[PDB]
Amino acid sequence: SDKIHHNTASWFTALTQHGKEELRFPRGQGVPINTNSGPDDQIGYYRRATRRVRGGDGKMKELSPRWYFYYLGTGPEASLPYGANKEGIVWVATEGALNTPKDHIGTRNPNNNAATVLQLPQGTTLPKGFYA
């Protein structure tokens, strides 16, 4: 009830990390646009996922990391409190978001719903190697 004042999948498409800089955002930035949610809901984390696949040459390749957004209290780190330190997790919250789990939003079932394209408010800062 406190507000911030500065199978299963993400609801959104990923942000691909094309360079050496890791994902992070200035406080107050980074929550994807979602017209179906309200100001209380605007809080969560990005989680890094890195995939591997064998190339045409038969050698195992590692692809560029992909960062996926999950609302607070949902997803692989559903039990983590806002701001908790964990490798591959970076927290974001819009001013005025409610520090409560987003049970009413949950996660996407890819069998039933396509991902929403991840879009950020105009003017959001990104590290080098990221494009939204």
Swiss-Prot record:
RNA binds at R51, R66, R108. Residues 7-132 form the CoV N NTD domain. Residues 7-132, 7-132 are annotated as: RNA-binding. Proteolytically cleaved by host CASP6. The cleavage leads to two fragments and facilitates viral replication by inhibiting host IFN signaling. The two fragments may interact with IRF3 inhibiting its nuclear translocation after activation and reduce the expression of IFNB and IFN-stimulated genes. It is found in: Virion; Host endoplasmic reticulum-Golgi intermediate compartment; Host Golgi apparatus; Host cytoplasm, Host perinuclear region. Belongs to the betacoronavirus nucleocapsid protein family. Packages the positive strand viral genome RNA into a helical ribonucleocapsid (RNP) and plays a fundamental role during virion assembly through its interactions with the viral genome and membrane protein M. Plays an important role in enhancing the efficiency of subgenomic viral RNA transcription as well as viral replication. May modulate transforming growth factor-beta signaling by binding host SMAD3. Homooligomer. Both monomeric and oligomeric forms interact with RNA. Interacts with protein M. Interacts with protein E. May bind to host HNRNPA1. Interacts with NSP3; this interaction serves to tether the genome to the newly translated replicase-transcriptase complex at a very early stage of infection. May interact with host SMAD3. Interacts with host PPIA/CYPA. This is Nucleoprotein. The chain holds residues 49 to 174 of 422 of the full protein.
